[PDB]
């Protein structure tokens, strides 16, 4: 490994050491995603204002976050909150907007049903999301091969079934593709049984990952729910069909071929439908049909890298999906 670095404000460093942000971060990441982060060091950022954090991977600034350490974030913010006389501190970051309120104001809003989050939990969800996306930077063949060792000491026969049909390279690619889209690989037993089933059937890694995803529907659903309702923006049959109608294939696998204008137009619709929502992209997902899920993720990720895209198959067996807008 090389270490992950969090540049933090001079004024906050002491509390962050005392809170053990560095290590708790790694622990919770393991609990959520089933993989080892490298060591995380804190370092004082020169000219960071008191509510800024910066992440460095390989000593290159990767993203800056605004977390108001003394305040609480309203996660399902609506404008109704202003009706209770609370005027939030607002930060605009990408085309997401974030609303922060005092501890006091926060307790009042909790009892009206709002879900509030502290600065450190928030900071973790932000780092988790960026690190899930940057999985290739610290997770590859060596770590895969080490996860397999741990699995072989429990389930040797299943490890061997999977290897009759997939190389260690291939399985690492699968795990990376799951994790890059924020799907946990903490249940290597289940994932392997799913590779056991599909890997002989499917020699295209992209198609394989989609079948593993289908097989893991219930787990993906539970994870994006947290311990609460799953907030979904539904992609309409209309948008779905422009994508479906663009799907091509020459010899290798299957790809999206849309006019430049056709894609820019789809993007303007998504953009503006999301601008109507007060909720941060990373607390939402998009729902769409199984065959177009991956195309929409490829299409939107350059611009909305936080917004994941679940298929309707992946939520069939959920209780608390809440569709809050259509596209």
UniProtKB/Swiss-Prot annotation:
Main localization, broad class: membrane
Protein name per its UniProtKB record: Invasion protein InvA
Keywords: Cell inner membrane, Cell membrane, Membrane, Protein transport, Transmembrane, Transmembrane helix, Transport, Virulence
The keyword Transmembrane belongs to this UniProt entry's keyword annotation: yes
Name of encoding gene: invA
GO BP annotation list: protein secretion
Function: Involved in the invasion of the cells of the intestinal epithelium. Could be involved in the translocation of the InvE protein.
Family: Belongs to the FHIPEP (flagella/HR/invasion proteins export pore) family.
Result of altering residue 46 to D: In strain: RKS2995 and RKS3057
Subcellular locations according to the entry: Cell inner membrane
Record's GO cellular component terms: plasma membrane
Residues of the full protein shown: 359 to 685 of 685
Outcome of mutating residue 242 to I: In strain: RKS2985 and RKS2993
